[PDB]
Design a binder for this molecule. Sequence first.
Ligand code: PVT
Length: 260
Amino acid sequence: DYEIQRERIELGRCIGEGQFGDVHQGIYMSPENPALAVAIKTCKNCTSDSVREKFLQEALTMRQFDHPHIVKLIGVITENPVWIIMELCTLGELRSFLQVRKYSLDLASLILYAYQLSTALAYLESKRFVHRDIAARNVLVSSNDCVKLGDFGLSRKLPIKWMAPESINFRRFTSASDVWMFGVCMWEILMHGVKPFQGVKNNDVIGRIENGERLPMPPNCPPTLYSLMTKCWAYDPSRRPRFTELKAQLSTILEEEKAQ
Ligand SMILES: O=C1Cc2cc(Nc3ncc(C(F)(F)F)c(NCc4cccnc4)n3)ccc2N1
């Protein structure tokens, strides 16, 4: 079931570049089922068994997950050319989607994306996985009302601007450090896909965080949501909320916005 027959894949257009090679969209002709839209990850140098093992590492990890807000692994093809087949999020990368729609996406949609991501991250935690790379660039858009976490490369250069202090200083990665990163991801969503700490050197960010400085309140962000983000950024990991508490509080914030 993990191994897929290449004859059941129809390769389509290139939709981006990955670490190991181009990614294309295509179709998976599932046995006795409707054809699924898929993302096919290619690997340029996978003729090397050493490169193949590194490329396939992420697919081995994805096989154990099953959640509505996490991209699904369909299968892999281990003969040359080696391919990784994922469920396709039709609308693409969340940052680009937010940047284009800055003056048209309503606030309830932005809060909904944060809520959905909190459910995927509570699920990740429940499986003893620590993501270590929560950022809007790793979120994909399945539809206008559905986002999914799509990159597990660092799961179970360093993204310093998203990292908790204990991860930068001591290489500690826990579900509480993922909560810090999720706070930064929520800020990126509320900022319509703007990167945190733009124009600031990585070492200047470290000194700013240690000194108590934090990302500012996004314009039009509900105060309760910004307070929630600042709690994700408590220096002491014990003072951060848990993903289950984030999910409950995001649901309340979403319903308060929907009731206008
Ligand atoms: O014109 C388009 C339409 C379109 C759809 C998608 N969807 C999509 N869904 C799932 C995945 C995967 F990770 F699960 F494999 C994926 N990976 C390629 C990718 C990821 C991040 C950033 N760039 C590319 N991409 C992406 C880009 C684009 N570009």
